[PDB]
């Protein structure tokens, strides 16, 4: 069970790339936090996700 953006999903076994692709989101405009570590969309690890993996996929948006 992988925590994606706060929601529990069955992502174990897939790669950050594969998921981000299914999400249908471009890699260059996002940053991916994998388990406390900061990665750009284009520089996410290739290692498949494991149960317990905490993932956050963020972008710059307007706000405050």
């Amino acid at each position: 069970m992988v925590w994606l953006n706060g929601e529990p999903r069955p992502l174990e076994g897939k790669t950050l790339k594969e998921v981000l692709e299914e999400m249908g989101v471009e890699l260059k405009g996002v940053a991916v936090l994998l388990n406390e570590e900061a990665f750009l969309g284009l520089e996410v690890p290739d290692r498949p996700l494991r149960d317990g993996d905490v993932v956050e996929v963020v972008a710059l948006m307007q706000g405050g």
Binding site: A31, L33, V58, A59, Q62
Partner: protein, 233 residues
Amino acid sequence: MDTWKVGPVELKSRLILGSGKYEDFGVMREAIAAAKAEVVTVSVRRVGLLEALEGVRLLPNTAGARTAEEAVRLARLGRLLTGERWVKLEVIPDPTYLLPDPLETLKAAERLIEEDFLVLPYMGPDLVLAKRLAALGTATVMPLAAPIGSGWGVRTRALLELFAREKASLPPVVVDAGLGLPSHAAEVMELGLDAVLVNTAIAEAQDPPAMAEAFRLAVEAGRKAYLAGPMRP
């Protein structure tokens, strides 16, 4: 020749704008230009703007953060996404009034600074906390005028005047959160304070661009009044 420095960065305009609340992006870019702003704050959040903000220096924030751990976390993500060294530190435990947690902003600022971050700390009108932040290293200090977006104006004037009194000892003092009219910014400038950060008042207006210019004139007028040495009532 009336420039001020945020750390190593030299800005001219004392009017720093914000991106939120803009209906679309076309108006936002009309606003940013009308005000002649150079620094615009942006927020980091879970999944077109970058294109609208081109020409301006992005100031990332940790909005949404409720603790020091969450703020540093968001700051890290913002660093990789903007490519900049400075960050608005915003730690609001409860969004109701949008007031910042003094102890949590202090904790997060100390972590970001030894992490090579340029901290621009969102805070309440606390002069003692401000001196702490300055001793930590934060490039600036930003007491709110009133609750964020309320449009209440300069309701922390009394305590804000103490910031002005202790001008020499603090980093540049930027008033953010509270201003609903240009005259509010003029007032804060005439006090001798460095800059002003306006969001709601511009985007939530019938004519954002037009109101972005008014704020431009106002912040210019107030700064000049301060330099011109006002009459004593």
